[PDB]
A paper describes a structure:
We recombinantly expressed and purified ZIKV NS5 RdRp (residues 306–903) of the MR/766 strain. The structure of the NS5 RdRp was refined to 1.9 Å resolution, with final Rwork and Rfree of 17 and 20%, respectively. The first 15 N-terminal and last 16 C-terminal residues are not visible in the electron density. Due to disorder, parts of loops 1 (residues 340–363), 3 (residues 408–417), 4 (residues 454–471), 5 (residues 533–542) and 6 (residues 576–606) are also missing in the model. Similar to DENV, the ZIKV NS5 RdRp binds to two Zn+2 ions, one at the finger (G439, H443, C448 and C451) and the other at the thumb (H714, C730, C849) domain. In ZIKV NS5 RdRp, they correspond to aspartates 535 (disordered in the structure) and 665, respectively. The priming loop of the ZIKV adopts a closed conformation when compared with the equivalent region in DENV2 (ligand bound) and DENV3 (ligand free and ligand bound), providing a smaller binding pocket. ZIKV RdRp priming loop has three glycine residues (G793, G801 and G803, respectively), which are replaced with bulkier amino-acid residues in DENV2 and DENV3 (S791, A799 and H801, respectively). These substitutions may provide additional flexibility to the ZIKV priming loop, thereby allowing it to adopt a closed conformation, similar to the ones adopted by JEV and WNV. While electrostatic surface of DENV2 and DENV3 are positively charged, the ZIKV priming loop binding site presents more neutral surface charge.
Author numbering: 321 to 340, 364 to 408, 417 to 454, 471 to 533, 542 to 576, 606 to 689, 695 to 887
Write the structure that this text describes.
């Protein structure tokens, strides 16, 4: 279950152990309904819901957007697959669900994938048309990779206010379903069926993001003393909620970064820290006040923090970072018991090229990545998965030169980089400050690491020996 290629090229980390509910009350529910209705209509000002098609689903399936992918392509080509979809949709239009599989017979597999299409048909517009994208939603970050999220926190840091602060009920589900009020009747019926029966047993990412935006809007309202204690059991003067949303809702949305259950909020002051009563009544929490962060570069978001670094020419980038033990520990884990050398080497290359794109600023990872890429045949294609995060978009899964990919991601298509001058040398690309690298787990200066770095070419040649000296290798170390 260990990746032997990564393990052999990371010997200093062999001794690193880090590597080796009651209902919300009536007033709370009315607040939730008011805020949810408001936000859905704001999100729908510039977008109209639509039914996604069989043809869109087929096009998506053919690009995986294991060997199950070949089975899925065969399924969507099968007329029997779509006849079964048509029959189950007949049930959905009556508010029932019968053949859908939510959690090995080919019939069971067809109806699991058919359930996925029915969800995509009814609710795929949320992702396909980027309803929770930051442009449309203020607080969402849908579509952004780890290479961009840090810029959002940097922008939020510029707003005045306090520090930065970092379980779906049936009532949350009812509020999510309010989007169906913007649909035609057929579409609304299809969406209500998918919402109800998926819950009863990615679209849930968009709906999770919506619910979290509502929750954070409510927390700000409590923090700013618009909502009072008695409003938990009976909302007095509900129009005050509408007035606050009108006056302040968009400003507060733009003070948020929300990705599913992950969120950062920049409130207008630090009353936010103890605004926990509606949060708790909604079952979303303990009464300890939240601890805020004064430094935006330390705020955790989507398992990372984000650091502003400068190229030699003075242009800045904002990079994702996490403790190095987590990155090396994951790369050393192989999920396949088959333990094929080629599949293992190709997965190691995937991790190395990920590090070159996103974690190049870690001294240990740039060296270890170049060692891995020098030890795996240059023609072998990266395979496997290196992260479960929706914000790791997989640009490293390629045989293209990673400096060209780096340039595309950080320069060419980076909207925060107006100067599009290409970077022609890896030596122009910065590391973290040494103290910051050390803070996040770097072994620089540790004698076993120095020895590993000094003899890394010997270790690379040993891996090549094991994989096969007649393969073709490139030298990324010199
Ligand atoms: Zn069904
Ligand atoms: Zn870090």
């Amino acid at each position: 279950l260990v990746n032997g290629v990564v393990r052999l090229l990371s010997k200093p980390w062999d001794v690193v152990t880090g590597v080796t509910v009651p209902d919300p009350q009536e007033g709370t529910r009315q607040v939730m309904n008011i805020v949810s209705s408001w936000l859905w209509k704001e999100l729908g000002k510039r977008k109209r819901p639509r039914v996604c098609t069989k043809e869109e689903f087929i096009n998506k399936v053919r690009s995986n957007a294991e060997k199950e992918w070949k089975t899925a392509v065969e399924a969507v080509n099968d007329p029997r697959f779509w006849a079964l979809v048509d029959r189950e949709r007949e049930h959905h239009l009556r508010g029932e669900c019968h053949s859908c599989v939510y959690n090995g017979s080919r019939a069971i597999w067809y109806m699991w994938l058919g359930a996925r299409f029915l969800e995509f048909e009814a609710l795929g517009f949320l992702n396909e048309d980027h309803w929770m994208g930051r442009e449309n939603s203020g607080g969402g970050v849908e579509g952004l990779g780890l290479q961009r999220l840090g810029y959002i926190l940097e922008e939020m840091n510029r707003a005045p206010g306090g520090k930065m602060y970092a379980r779906i009920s049936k009532f949350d589900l009812e509020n999510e379903a309010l989007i169906t009020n913007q649909m035609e009747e057929g579409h609304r019926t299809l969406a209500l069926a998918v919402i109800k029966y998926t819950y009863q047993n990615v679209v849930t990412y968009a709906l999770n993001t919506f619910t979290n935006l509502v929750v954070q809007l409510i927390r700000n309202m409590e923090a700013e003393e618009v909502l009072e204690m008695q409003d938990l059991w009976l909302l007095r003067k509900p129009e005050k909620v509408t007035r606050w949303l009108q006056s302040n809702g968009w400003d507060r949305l733009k003070r948020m970064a929300v990705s599913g259950d992950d969120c950062v909020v920049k409130p207008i002051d630090d009353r936010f820290a103890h605004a926990l009563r509606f949060l708790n009544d909604m079952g979303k929490v303990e009464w300890k006040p939240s601890t805020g962060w004064s430094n935006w570069e330390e705020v955790p978001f989507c398992s990372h923090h984000f650091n502003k670094l400068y190229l030699k020419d003075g242009r800045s980038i904002v990079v994702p970072c996490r403790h190095q033990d987590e990155l090396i520990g994951r790369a050393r884990v192989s999920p396949g018991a088959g333990w094929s050398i080629r599949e293992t080497a190709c997965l190691a290359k995937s991790y190395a090229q990920m590090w070159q794109l996103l974690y190049f600023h870690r001294r240990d990872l740039r060296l270890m990545a170049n060692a891995i890429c020098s030890a795996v045949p240059v023609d072998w294609v990266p395979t496997g998965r290196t992260t479960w995060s929706i914000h790791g978009k997989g640009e490293w899964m390629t045989t293209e030169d990673m400096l060209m990919v780096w340039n595309r991601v950080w320069i060419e298509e980076n909207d925060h980089m107006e100067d599009k001058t290409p970077v022609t040398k890896w030596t122009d690309i910065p590391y973290l400050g040494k103290r910051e690298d050390l803070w996040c787990g770097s072994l620089i200066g540790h004698r076993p690491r120095t020895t590993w770095a000094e003899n890394i070419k010997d270790t690379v040649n040993m891996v090549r020996r094991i994989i096969g000296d007649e393969e073709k290798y490139m030298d990324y170390l010199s």
